[PDB]
Amino acid sequence: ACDYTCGSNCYSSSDVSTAQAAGYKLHEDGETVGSNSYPKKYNNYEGFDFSVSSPYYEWPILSSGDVYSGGSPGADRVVFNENNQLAGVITHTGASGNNFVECT
Ligand SMILES: [Ca+2]
Numbered sequence: 001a002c003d004y005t006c007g008s009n010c011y012s013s014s015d016v017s018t019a020q021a022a023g024y025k026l027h028e029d030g031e032t033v034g035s036n037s038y039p040k041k042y043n044n045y046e047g048f049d050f051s052v053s054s055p056y057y058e059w060p061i062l063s064s065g066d067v068y069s070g071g072s073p074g075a076d077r078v079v080f081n082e083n084n085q086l087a088g089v090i091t092h093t094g095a096s097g098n099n100f101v102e103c104t
Pocket of ligand 1: 010011012015064065
């Protein structure tokens with residue numbers, strides 16, 4: 001089964017854990033990767049019920065299972081906070097322009 005489903009993408013807890021670890025390390029190092037510069041600050045304008053406190057940061061999680069290294073980031077993102085706590089997994093799949101919907 002999928003622990004998280006973003007549109008047609010299936011993710012296991014292992015996959016979110018791995019993506020989060022990479023994003024958080026970049027966060028600690030003050031570094032970013034890709035043309036859009038990830039990890040970047042996540043603003044919760046959609047008002048998703050996370051039980052972890054802000055600030056929040058978004059990092060791409062890839063359907064391939066590969067850790068994001070540049071190139072196309074796809075539509076899915078792992079949201080983590082300043083204390084390296086997982087807030088959730090979101091996606092642009094099925095949302096107009098910059099809206100996000102939560103993975104199921
Ligand atoms: Ca996987």
